[PDB]
């Protein structure tokens, strides 16, 4: 992890989380559960969707490409024509595999960053009203019910 979050200080993922990519768990007096941060999750969906389409927009469409015959006295043009077809083929094959390799690295880092930023957002809200237990978990000092938890999620935990 380039940002230390995913598979970093937050060792594993939650199969229990099924509303988005990033979220909170919470263990209040009223009961536990999971909840996805729609804000960061959607923004991620939009970005990745854009990426996928940007990749596709670049790689043109192939229309009609047919061969050419050559007679026994046109061996040079024939090889020239092959050098041209093999050349562009290799180039485009390179471009496509390379772009995908590079964007796959970016994408995983992108997610890592978002998880990280989310942790810092939550942390910057709770300040000292809760301590960092590690594993991205925040143990509260003052009892926080579901109504309270919810406020932390939508970033309106507005409480001294």
């Amino acid at each position: 992890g380039l940002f230390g979050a995913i598979a970093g200080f937050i060792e594993g993922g939650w199969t229990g989380l099924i509303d988005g990519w990033y979220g909170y768990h919470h263990q209040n007096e009223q009961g536990s559960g999971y909840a996805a941060d729609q804000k960061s999750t959607q923004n991620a969906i939009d970005g990745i969707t854009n990426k996928v389409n940007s990749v596709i927009e670049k790689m043109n469409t192939q229309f009609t490409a047919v061969g050419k015959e050559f007679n026994n006295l046109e061996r040079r043009i024939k090889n020239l024509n092959k050098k041209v077809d093999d050349g562009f083929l290799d180039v485009w094959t390179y471009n496509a595999e390379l772009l995908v390799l590079l964007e796959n690295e970016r994408t995983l880092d992108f997610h890592d960053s978002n998880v990280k930023n989310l942790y810092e957002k939550a942390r910057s809200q709770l300040r000292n009203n809760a301590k960092e237990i590690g594993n991205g978990c925040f143990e509260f000092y003052h009892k926080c019910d579901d109504a309270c938890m919810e406020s932390v999620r939508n970033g309106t935990y507005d409480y001294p």
Partner: protein, 324 residues
């Protein structure tokens, strides 16, 4: 009370590669590479391909006796030659600028065949009934190209002939013809009387003269003589004139061509089928929205970019760590 921050995980087994690490399991991804086809030659734009079968383009345009099945076809989505397209020029000889003509047909989507020089009215002074050979058989009996007419001396006489056609089809007209070369001076005389015949062909831009080259070359299909084939595209409104004192294998049928780029000629052994597609390859039709395909570099229609890749998967989700 506790509030943790975590990320999604699932039962996905999808894996992608990255610069730093390979075979990374992920939660979500999309395959950009299409590798499936129906293994059939289908219609494009509701139009069937021209299946040349056991015939090649030469055999098609000249009207080789073995290609009668193609006689009534005049429009196609693309032309298909198979590995066994061997029936072409049944009478041995050089087919001049043959590859160029194939290149030309690649952007022809249909045509109107018409008897440019009717056989029964165009040559009062020459024999039109004996231009057959064992080299171009049909039903076991000697025959000849359907679109050409082998003219010979009539009652020991081959007067200078002169024929002209003026193209009023409103489009390009492909005109094919041949020049026969007997193996012997005796054959030359038996066929055309005139020991020193010649053939002349001219239009506004075309201009060539042919002289018989008498000689015995190795027999091909029983023939020691040779027959060379020629063609030209007569422009709308232009005129083509044939002059000869022997050796002319006159045009009988010609083609008024309709241009339609976006078409082509492919080599496939895949079978034609009652089916439709937006994308066609020599192996079969592709039906997908992915940007890449590794089926075949030759394409006709709307198709994904051909690539040599075996795998192209883009990660969209994140490193899947269920730690179950």
């Amino acid at each position: 009370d506790t509030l943790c921050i975590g990320y999604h995980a699932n039962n996905s087994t999808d894996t992608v590669d990255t610069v730093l690490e390979k075979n990374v399991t992920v939660t979500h991804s999309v395959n950009l590479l299409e590798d499936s086809h129906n293994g059939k030659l289908c219609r494009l734009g509701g139009i069937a391909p021209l299946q040349l079968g056991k015939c090649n383009i030469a055999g098609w345009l000249l009207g080789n006796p073995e290609c009668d099945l193609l006689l009534t076809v005049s429009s196609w989505s693309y032309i298909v030659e198979t590995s066994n397209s061997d029936n072409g020029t049944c009478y041995p000889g050089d087919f001049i600028d043959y590859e160029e003509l194939r290149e030309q047909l690649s952007s022809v989507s249909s045509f109107e065949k018409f008897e440019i020089f009717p056989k029964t009215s165009s040559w009062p002074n020459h024999e039109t009934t004996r231009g057959v050979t064992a080299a171009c058989p049909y039903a076991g009996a000697s025959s000849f190209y359907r679109n050409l007419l082998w003219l010979v001396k009539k009652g020991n006489s081959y007067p200078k002939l002169s024929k002209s056609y003026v193209n009023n089809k409103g489009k390009e007209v492909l005109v094919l013809w041949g020049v026969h070369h007997p193996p012997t001076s005796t054959d030359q005389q038996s066929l055309y009387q005139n020991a020193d015949a010649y053939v002349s062909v001219g239009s506004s831009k075309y201009d060539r003269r042919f002289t018989p080259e008498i000689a015995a070359r190795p027999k091909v299909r029983g023939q020691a003589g040779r027959m060379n084939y020629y063609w030209t595209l007569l422009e709308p409104g232009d005129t083509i004139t044939f002059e000869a004192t022997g050796n002319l294998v006159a045009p009988r049928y010609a083609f008024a061509l309709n241009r339609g780029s976006g078409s082509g000629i492919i080599t496939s052994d895949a079978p034609v089928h009652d089916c439709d597609t937006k994308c066609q390859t020599p192996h079969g039709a592709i039906n997908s929205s992915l940007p890449f395909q590794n089926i075949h570099p030759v394409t006709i229609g709307e198709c994904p970019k051909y690539v040599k890749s075996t795998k192209l998967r883009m990660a969209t989700g994140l490193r899947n760590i269920p730690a179950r």
